[PDB]
């Protein structure tokens with residue numbers, strides 16, 4: 001427990017300053033633990049309180065329903081892009097370790113997921129794929145460049161060595177080699193040539209196996225792959241960075257005829273395949289097109305979603321309805337970042353609002369059956385880059401290279417309030433409120449049977465409340481305006 005070194009840049013809250021020698025780091029019975037973060041500057045502060053036998057009053061009461069069991073959690077993490085790798089590696093090795101520990105160790109927030117782009121995306125400094133020699137249908141010339149072998153792969157190793165928990169890797173491609181594409185370019189409107197089942201589709205499926213083979217030779221194995229990053233982007237004329245367009249029918253036939261059979265016939269047949277990897281407004285339509293074909297469905301473990309157009313997609317109509325029709329196909333949130341809108345400032349150092357966007361999104365996803373949530377770039381520079389098309393965004397950790405300093409933003413702690421306290425295999429359970437309120441809250445059970453409740457207060461008003469666990473007792477507490485709290489207690493004791 002070293003405390004946050006706070007620094008303001010004139011926005012609503014502070015960042016925590018870390019460097020080569022310093023970084024901030026991390027109950028009895030029947031007491032509960034409370035972790036709290038506030039706009040005013042508290043950073044995952046620990047306190048404790050008594051679990052009471054009785055409660056009286058008419059105040060807000062949140063009641064656990066521990067016998068209502070919902071989805072099990074896969075976990076939380078972020079993406080190791082070329083830009084994240086280049087940023088982290090621009091620090092001195094000691095500052096690098098403190099940055100990886102912040103995310104991956106028990107002294108930090110315990111990430112257990114790392115998303116890995118297959119070749120280049122907009123958060124790359126050059127465009128490249130793994131098989132750029134034209135008409136190499138044999139993929140004889142497939143190979144990993146230094147972006148992978150010298151940047152991403154060694155950092156992923158280091159994160160695994162530091163990791164508290166077992167870490168799951170997830171791969172997604174942005175574009176194919178350009179000689180496989182209708183438009184011959186890495187961006188713009190265009191798709192695989194021909195139709196699924198053919199030589200182009202067969203080659204593209206083999207590229208995935210080649211990628212898995214090459215990472216396996218570097219001693220990394222993958223938990224999952226997605227069939228394409230944002231397949232709908234490549235349907236859009238002028239789309240400015242790497243993409244590869246699929247309608248839902250095209251994705252259905254490609255999974256059924258090429259990508260599913262190819263992976264199932266390889267040494268990597270245990271890797272899960274996620275469909276969609278795109279905006280949730282596309283659900284449930286895309287799930288119905290793909291999953292009602294039993295040749296496609298037998299290969300699809302789950303559905304990945306991105307948050308960018310959520311304001312158009314109420315979770316009930318999209319996530320909820322998809323769960324209702326396809327309860328056994330997990331929903332997983334695979335990409336989010338703030339500062340993506342063209343009128344937004346890319347990086348707002350110390351923004352409390354951006355933190356709340358994360359935790360509000362995460363809670364809403366958990367309440368609609370989503371099993372994990374993945375941030376985008378692990379780290380960026382103060383401009384939100386590098387990025388070859390200047391599509392700068394925000395990141396929970398901002399690296400200041402000329403100073404060998406990095407900043408942990410409020411997004412980092414809002415994330416930590418879930419990732420740290422909700423390990424893989426945790427299970428969400430029911431939670432009901434006694435009256436209308438401005439809190440977002442979710443309850444889960446840890447694998448050992450203990451309880452975890454996360455409470456975000458979306459309003460400026462302090463809200464006193466009680467949490468009832470039936471046959472354990474009552475936790476009397478207060479939720480300050482804008483704050484985020486995580487409550488942990490042993491019930492089974």
Ligand SMILES: *[C@@H]1O[C@H](CO)[C@@H](O[C@@H]2O[C@H](CO)[C@@H](O[C@H]3O[C@H](CO)[C@@H](O)[C@H](O)[C@@H]3O)[C@H](O)[C@H]2NC(C)=O)[C@H](O)[C@H]1NC(C)=O
Pocket residue numbers: 005018019020021022
């Ligand atoms: C790495 O970050 C470290 C944490 O901020 C930083 O160290 C700490 O530096 C400050 C400022 O020099 C020291 O601060 C203050 O303490 C002095 C001495 O008592 C007071 O007179 C000042 O008013 C001030 O509040 C901390 O005591 C110091 N020590 C630690 C370990 O926290 C390092 O300097 C940073 N490294 C670089 C290259 O900047």
Ligand SMILES: [Cl-]
Pocket residue numbers: none
């Ligand atoms: Cl402003």
